[PDB]
Symmetry: C3
């Protein structure tokens, strides 16, 4: 099989990577199989659970977790295993070992981790993509890389590194979102990340209505443009 | 028996619920019995311990914990078990199971969880109270409810939900504190919460000098103004 | 043996204590022996690991931890055991028990914990030092003490207290750094802390180039006198 994973919060800005995986799961109608709920991994003041209360009674309680679901794009015999959920607060090493065990039983060939970061970049020009891979040969996609060559990492980079150590090829892509538009209905970068998924897994992914949403997005950010304009700086 | 519990920090604003339970324990002279100290539940950078040092030496070290004490209002037949302490950072599920075991041994009939939140509300008019209960028949006290009908919860709501699942009747009340006066000597809401305690447990609670403190409080907030009849805004 | 320990983050401001221990380890060429890596102690969103990536590939992954190394100052025949690393987020009690086991195997006589805090104090006058010790006689170095006589503590104070309880003499010193110059290249307080280390352990520490760096530091803060005022205020 093959994996596309994405982690919320720190490792995802504008919800680009989360939305990317969401879009795959919608398009190809993914089947839930495994959910990693363990309280060994989660600080619940940081990642609070979600309550749903109606007419004086709670009707639903939702705990932070890692959702793993399964997929088959219509033409292909690539199974695609999707992973999505919040970045745990603890026991990362064992969290990664767990995911690897899932990987092992499902006979996964390749892992692709999507993420997104805030950078100094125009919204009126393409999405910069950065990342890392399992070797210098695999960096065929990159000579250079992401905002931190040295510095703090998240679960994306760790897990990536846990795969490489485990001997599974693994690549992470990071989409650069303009810091001034941080609100998380961003489709532009989601597109960009999805295309990287095509590139690694070699199966076409239907973008559907995303371009329309991107073009509407980009126009209606240029909408708020009375004298507020560090753009020249950024554009070049 | 019967429980009144309250959790600090997120679930308590103005220290209204904490002060409510404090006031019960003072009034009825509660006897400490159980203290849940476990380091399985607490992130100590978030909830730091309190040191006491005198003349070059530490004389006391105080660890965050859950204090459980016992009570008997004088006229009353009924034991009141009080719970007070900071909201754990982790293993909520097992934390709640633990409390339930305490509940089981002590044969508790009913649980009442107090909390308080910051809202848009005048300080010159009554305290809005919201919450949830074990059945819609029991929401007699409420048609409509708390700031998040859907959204992130705290230990109050979880524990509440753990009681309901365990088959113990449980109700939570949330007092609405004006965000502009957040400093935590608030008596007004404490009163309000206490009255909800009367309503559920049906034992009168002596308020003593709380009204005096409330009226002094309310007058001395109406004292501090220029430019800022924002309160006229919340006339409505 | 004898210990000099220092903890990062909360307990070290200006990187005074960290730099102090660093300077000892450089000067006396300390030998790494033990590294406490355990994921029982660390919340990894708070203390993130450090990635190093070069030309599309990660080349290094560095996990937060407690480094313990060994030392023998040249004249002396006492071993100095150095400890340095970030303040854990959890299981402090067991973290301290662990360190104590190290202490036990190494037959440690005395522990000295260095720290630093932001205070209202001039940069043009000496470094105020505060702290606590194992007894009132031991406070010969202090009648009086730390910013928090009562209030929240860190791992420094806890560990200190764990040593005292274990029967090992232990002293903590806290250097007062001017809040307005917080940037962590401060040598002034590092000197001060180092001198306290001399005082307890009675072995001279070569300061090397530190004074030069301190006087340069102090002159080039007095250099930026465009805004700053209220000199007199702190000056007494």
């Amino acid at each position: 099989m093959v994996v596309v994973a994405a982690f919320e919060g720190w490792n995802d800005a504008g919800d680009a990577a989360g939305d990317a995986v969401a879009h795959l799961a919608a398009s190809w109608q993914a089947l839930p199989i495994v959910e990693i709920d363990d309280e060994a991994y989660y600080d619940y003041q940081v990642n609070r659970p979600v309550i749903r209360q109606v007419d004086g009674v709670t009707r639903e309680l939702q705990w932070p977790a890692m959702r793993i679901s399964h997929c088959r794009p219509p033409g292909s015999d690539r199974d695609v295993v999707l992973m999505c959920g919040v970045e745990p607060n603890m026991r990362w090493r064992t969290f990664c070992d767990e995911l690897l065990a899932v990987i092992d039983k499902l006979n996964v060939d390749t892992v692709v981790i999507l993420g997104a970061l805030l950078a100094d970049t125009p919204h009126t020009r393409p999405v910069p993509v950065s990342g890392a891979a399992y070797s210098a040969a695999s960096a065929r996609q990159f000579g250079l890389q992401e905002t931190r060559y040295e510095g703090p990492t998240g679960i994306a980079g760790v897990f990536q590194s846990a795969c490489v150590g485990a001997g599974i090829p693994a690549v992470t892509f990071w989409a650069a979102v303009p810091h001034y538009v941080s609100h998380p209905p961003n489709p532009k970068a989601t597109i960009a990340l999805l295309r990287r998924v095509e590139d690694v897994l070699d199966v076409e992914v239907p973008l559907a209505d995303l371009p329309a949403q991107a073009e509407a997005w980009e126009r209606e950010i240029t909408e708020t443009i009375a004298e507020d304009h560090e753009l020249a700086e950024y554009v070049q």
